[PDB]
Amino acid sequence: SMITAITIMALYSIVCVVGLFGNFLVMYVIVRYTKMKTATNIYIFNLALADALATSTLPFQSVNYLMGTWPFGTILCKIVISIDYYNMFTSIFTLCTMSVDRYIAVCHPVKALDFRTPRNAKIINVCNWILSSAIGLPVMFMATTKYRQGSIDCTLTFSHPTWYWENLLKICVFIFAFIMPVLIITVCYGLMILRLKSVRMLSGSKEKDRNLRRITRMVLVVVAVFIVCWTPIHIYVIIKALVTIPETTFQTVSWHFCIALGYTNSCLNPVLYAFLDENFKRCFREF
């Protein structure tokens, strides 16, 4: 229908503008009114980047939907599929890195004096970008442009069993992009909040407790937005893997909404990690 197309295309496209706008502004403001000197700006920039890059893979997907076929070749697909599965792990890893960084900052201050350096932050970023390659490269070496119903589909391709490697890739993407990141985020932030409970200038008078509550709300919002955004797509992918479902309009809309919701984390990160930082606001408050 035109309605299904309108909706499945309106969401995909709108996610794209929002994402690329915010990510690009933060990336821009990090390099104009801020300067990457702290480990935080370095992580915020690197996340802003991966999110901009990943949202950039959306327009191809949306056209692949409306045109019903890939028209870009077997080279642009490999640059599309791979960039998608690469900026997925690079942003999640950066989120986990930010969580662990804050956890060390609060619960290990003395050691944080030795570990929290701008020079070590760059090493951690390079490590994240190299760990993302372990999933990026095989994806680049497996993308194809097979033909379906007189229309090419540039999905990935796996050797012999095919189901075995496909499901192993699914499990790997579900454990190291959903479960493990959720575990680090939750545990690190929970321990951080537990420690912040005792800290003196956060307890006591009304305003100190207000600041403590503000920090707690920000932390909870971060954790929620991650889980809410990433859970549906992973769960529904699992469901599709186990059993087959009718190709109802509801099904297609649910698919595309889940995919775009998964991408919506890239659009929310700019506001959740840059616009809600006191330093970023202290930059915004002077012009």
């Binding site: 998608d84 599965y85 540039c154 993407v173 797509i233 995919i259």
Partner: peptide, 5 residues
């Protein structure tokens, strides 16, 4: 995730 792929 799950648009190519």
């Amino acid at each position: 995730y799950x648009g190519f792929x």
